């Protein structure tokens, strides 16, 4: 009814792409809870892209953020980017935000918060160590699962323990991230943007963007292997994340982002494709068109024919063969 | 283990290729009372749309229906259409009509004597308002929804409001009816039939069968647009009744037409093929092929991804734009 | 972490391609009970098939096998099998096998032992009836369901019930062999080897392989459709079988592989290629790709659809057309 | 089925006064593991306290009991207990230790090994500092608390939560092994022992034995008291771990004793009959009268009551008056 | 972790016993939501319980209690009752009572505003019909029933309907304080107090103070029986009110005091000594010793069996015995 | 609020002396259906019972009771049975078991008819071979618990497994019957009714009643261990039809006849104080006063404690020893 709340889910349609359907579909508060999660995180998410924003004018803009929740008529005119029409009317945004319960307000503030920080201190510098891969997925990925699965308990469709197992929280949001930032790889190259962990690639060329180069085709799938080998370590959490999961609605919001995930990762694996546009989805096995991600044992099924799609696809060359069978073995198996 | 049971199905899988599946699937008695339903109304139908049976001796017969039903030797040996032989072989299908159990005989011959009624005053006459376009619309599908859904509650498989709410239930068959209307535009030109209401599309031409004219496609596709909006006016009835639904068998077969039907409305609207044959329902998201309407959330989710297919595709310049864009917005939000 | 078990999944993989994901979604303790319950029963067939195995050595096997269980360093290095590696690295999956709980050791021992001793007396003969034809499929399959039946009881995941009904346990398990039979014909054929029971053939030739001859092509159909006629008793069976499920991961497993094969025989009827070629599996009403093999009802109607496929091309020119006609009658009205 | 499982349960239930049943009561694998788990958990405790061995002999079987778990034929007929039998014939249950999954097997041995190093550790000295009886009860207690909770996690009955927080599952332990220890007092006196911290009884006489003099009692009831004061700093951690239960089985097996231990603190405080023999449970009031440890809120009820039984009988004449009302009044609140 | 929220547990403790744990062991916002609805509530009961208040005054105290929750610093430092400490540090309860969410305040606020008018409106007078006896009860009691019923509806742990249905929230309020009152006779005579509805004792003696004399008993005990037959009314909608409660913590909270009640007037039923002293509520038996009172059927189990234990000792010339009989007999068959 | 309802509930508080507190909890319609069908088998009864009746005016009486069902005027005012009334007043429960869903009709009849058949084939013989007493135990019992069980899964309030597993159904009858059998053995004999089987007894004594002369107190007492070792065989189907339940009121129902079975088998092993008066249940160890019989773990704990007792009290001199040490360990591992 509300001419705001209408507003919101017209941004929510227009910000997102392949998640207004499913989060549109839970049940209760939630809907609402998540809409608005997803719209703030949208608006934050768009101040740290936009690079027409001097660091010493950004740095304060995603430390503050949290605190323009509660500043009714806050809002940002100088954005250049696409999405940015949540930023120029957030006050509309933050109307409802200020609607939600107070419990939902609570995980909401403190999430862009920590975010807040997180991609201030990213701000100056590119992603080195692969231990600090998973931090900066941490902070822009992981502490949405984090605060997604907070909310969820916090409207009591969920067990109190979803929420409280941050750690697997954190990991659906890493799998979906590097999975992303893998992806992306050209799109964010010929974007001015550098994800890929240097500490890894650096050991394929010189710079990150030679992996553009079609003379380094051959080393650029050694790297990109290699960091799927890496975000594959993430599936066990995955699965056992999911398994909690009691409410359908949520299921599904859960499961099928991640599943795609893994269905975009076996599309990618040590396939040239990734360094000269876009790598299409496509399908694998009978079974992955019999059953769908709707119940636990089926996501489970989907995953592991994915997981031999890449399996099967394993060069012995390839300078992570054997840790690429390692993770997919105890994923298998355990 | 009846020789005329047998044979009622025989004549379901005859005469309700589509629906027959879903229909043996169904609990218990549903299933008996379901069949012989889909039998008497596939008579009836086939005696409306007989075109040798003289009005004359239509009404009478349209009229007195549901009175057949307990007329041991009543048959019809005078149809010449194809599946006629539900009439000529009525015995055997009233008979195990008579079998079922008082409350389903209630339903069922209730709703043979109502659309027997409504076939009659149509017989001799087009759809001129948009009134009288729910009002055929009701004669001919609403009253399956109703009568389905009384008997869905009847069995006690589904709450008595299943059965209560005769608009939710009318809902059901009104987006089916006015969708497959849309849809069949043309092959129903090409068989001297109109059911497009007149006072839509006399305000784009002379004739409902000018829009087969190439030199007015344009105008076709701004009513088929209009209507198309006048369909969806429906979703939110329709998700309430899915919503309410306890049973799986009975969700498997409620669900799956509504979905078939939007994504049937999905891929007509602005587009020009309606006019020139018969349009191709285009695949769907990512976020569709990982589901199935199996559970409500992914059918909400299935739904509402449709309802934004629609929106990528609304032009300003259509004269509908703004009321499409609206009620969409509406569903959206609730 | 045991790299035994880690290595028993990459051969079940190897082995069983499809069944292998939906295994590992088995929930809790089943998932390495039937993993390793395919393993050691792979490793049987595989001594039974391999045809560079005089018979007086290979009955002792057979009959042994069930006993080598508990020989720890028990292998078999002589076989020229695709799958002998399960042979060769037994000791591996013995090994594995003996860490399973004590009460389901005693379930797959069991099996493996009457199933030795029926293969050892089919060496020296031929199917010739029909109720010989019954007697090999419950020794190669019918007793794996209700191999699978006990240990879904004893793991207590199912209903007591599940496992002490072996006539439909064995029916889910004759309704698979009798399919991959009817649709390896050829295959299985150039291999030297005849599973048609001689009593059915040998009234369309005298030669079984007389139907590979592009000639008599239509008697074999006929008698392909005779067969087909002979597999579709079972369903009554299946369908009873999967309606006492309970566990989601457990019907996932049971459904899918049945819903294949039914899906199998419909594409393989009166289909003339099932003697020329591999007959791929076709399509089904876009009311069945709008399902999937998770729930009851469903499966009920993905089924009964595949019924109908069969019985409108049913010939009358057909020695069978009345019995293929009878029994999908009394699947449509149990 | 097998004798040596049965002989396992003969002695669970010669050793086990009152848990048998409970124990026998657990659900699916956790049920054969925890049997196993306390039997040699009670051999190794046999070994721990049969003074007819010399320390220098016991300290290595302490070191080494882990070890013989994988030693068939290991066994020691030379102990002169109460429940020899579980080490004259432990090679029966050695032998079904190695029958229980390998992941149980790691938590049950690895607790062994570290159980019998303290166990050995505190052989030659007596309890001091009170840091120090946290230590001692986490030897032979915490870690059986801690190894519980890793096999409840590990068959996946309960949430990974339960296992990996190993600070409550210590909780769990030292709260059972304080209440114990407080309440046998003189039973540990005349047996020759000494578990009180005697940084703590010290401060209030010369000799731990001094406590059972008749002229002593005014000190004995004041140290007395300011145990169960520490003691009853365990409760929060012992309301968030039964907290996190899910499965009835082992709620039952958790909370049981749990509250069998505050009601033996709340008829021990500021009691004198402590050192004048045992103490009896005689009844818990009218809510504890109509509700049972079988939910949690019941459960958190009962153990408010038992805190205010003893809320009330502190007399402001005591020394650990004051923490005691101030531990109590934040069990409480939170 | 609130010294003043610390203290104002200490009082709940400290006023109510019944209530106090499982109070506290309401599910989160509940609980101190409802400690602090009984904190005013026992304070409210305080004064307008205090004969050492002339009226002129108190009157104004129960009129304007509901304002002193938002005035700081209020407190009434002249009570001579021993609870007086709820209103001298009223100002603690009011300060925690503002920290609690506006919905909460809502409900108590309006009942406390409500509760006082009534109060004072029988600070004049004694109850006299039966009517004015069951709206006293509304005014002390009823209410109480209603104001938590709507704080669990509130907090969303319960359906809206429990806080809706003000009726049997009322018969729950309703069925205590009548079992108390008429228990409490002896006591509240010697406290110069008097509940027991006139036009009923006065058939049969010319007091209400009567009852005390030893002459008086018999008729004493037919009185007793009057009104214990008058509130077995009231079980009815206990019973559908717990029916419809989900949520365990409410449950106890609302399921034990009411089988405490049921307890009591089966205790009290044609026993003398509720004019003697307190009766000793004769515990379970055979199968409620079977039982607790934490899920439905077995409060009801409990509940009829005490319905039983009264009937069986009615006495035919009791003139009430015929309605003892009705009641009973229509709570057995409903 | 019906007349003759109300004193259906009257006749079947009088008739059960305990089951009627748990039958009125039963949830829906099984409420009123048990209850009738708990008072024409009660009527039923009394005819077979009744020894002041013919041989051949009692036969076509118990071999047409079930007919009786639809007879509106029939009833015997001839029994001279303490429960006559259920038999003079027959027409109050007809009309009511005639006011039950047909359903029910159908199921509660068939077993009057199966039963009284038995019934009949009983007075002229005596119950000689153990596989006769288990007939007639099915005929007195079995054949009540397959009813009930018929009734539950026809309720639709437990699955449709439970009423399809007569087998285990019937041990739940037969655990029961023999043990009234058992624990009577002075009132069935000071009646002149003999039920303990010949064949245990016979090669004992001559006399049947012989067990009640103090001269052969032994040969009486290893009679009555050898026929409770008997007995103890049926509790692994206790165990498990209990486990098979799902509806909190109908485990209650059927889960604390069986726990009091147990209880007076404890009870009444190796007692003589059988043979000389009325033995009654003694109390449970710690364990179980700390759990009510409504949750299936804390019912194991209770079998698994009182088949303890037992245990303990097995005399090596007894010589059905062994036996009841073979049978209760098995139960130990369930
Ligand atoms: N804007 C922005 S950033 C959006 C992408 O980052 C995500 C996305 C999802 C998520 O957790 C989920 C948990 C379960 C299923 C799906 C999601 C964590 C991080
Ligand atoms: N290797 C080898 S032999 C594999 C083929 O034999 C089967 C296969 C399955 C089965 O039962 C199932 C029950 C339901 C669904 C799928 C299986 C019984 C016999």
Redesign the pocket.
């Known amino acids: 009814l509300s001419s705001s709340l209408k507003t919101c889910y017209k941004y929510l349609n227009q910000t997102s792409r392949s998640?207004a359907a499913v989060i549109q579909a839970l049940d209760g508060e939630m809907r609402n809870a998540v809409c608005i999660f997803?719209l703030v995180?949208?608006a934050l998410?768009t101040l740290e892209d936009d690079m027409t924003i001097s660091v010493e004018k950004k740095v304060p803009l995603l430390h503050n953020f949290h605190s323009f929740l509660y500043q009714p008529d806050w809002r940002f005119m100088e954005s250049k980017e696409k999405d940015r029409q949540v930023l120029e009317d957030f006050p509309t945004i933050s109307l409802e935000f200020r609607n939600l319960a107070e419990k939902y307000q609570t995980v909401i503030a403190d999430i862009c918060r920590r975010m807040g920080i997180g991609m201030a201190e990213f701000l100056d510098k590119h992603v080195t160590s692969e231990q600090e891969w998973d931090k900066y997925c941490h902070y822009?990925?992981?502490?949405?699962?984090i605060?997604?699965?907070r909310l969820f308990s916090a409207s009591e469709f969920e067990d109190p323990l979803v929420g409280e197992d941050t750690e697997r929280?954190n990991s659906?949001?890493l799998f979906?991230?590097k999975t992303?930032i893998i992806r992306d790889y050209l799109e964010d190259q010929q974007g001015g943007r550098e994800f890929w962990p240097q500490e890894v690639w650096s050991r394929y060329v010189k710079k990150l963007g030679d992996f553009a180069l079609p003379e380094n085709i051959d080393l650029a799938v050694q790297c990109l292997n290699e960091l799927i080998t890496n975000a594959l370590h993430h599936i066990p959490d995955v699965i056992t994340?999911?398994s909690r999961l009691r409410n359908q609605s949520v299921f599904n919001?859960?499961?099928?982002?991640?599943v795609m995930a893994i269905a975009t990762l076996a599309a990618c694996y040590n396939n040239q494709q990734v360094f000269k546009g876009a790598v299409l989805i496509r399908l694998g096995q009978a079974v992955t068109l019999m059953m769908d991600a709707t119940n636990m044992p089926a996501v489970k099924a989907i995953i592991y024919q994915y997981m031999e799609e890449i399996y099967h696809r394993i060069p012995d060359s390839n300078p992570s063969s054997s840790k690429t069978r390692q993770i997919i073995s105890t994923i298998r198996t355990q």
Chains 1, 2, 3, 4, 5, 6 share one sequence.
């Open positions: 998640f997803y995180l949208r998410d822009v990925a992981g502490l949405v699962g605060g997604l699965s929280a659906m949001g979906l991230q992303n994340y999911l919001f859960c499961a099928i982002p991640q």
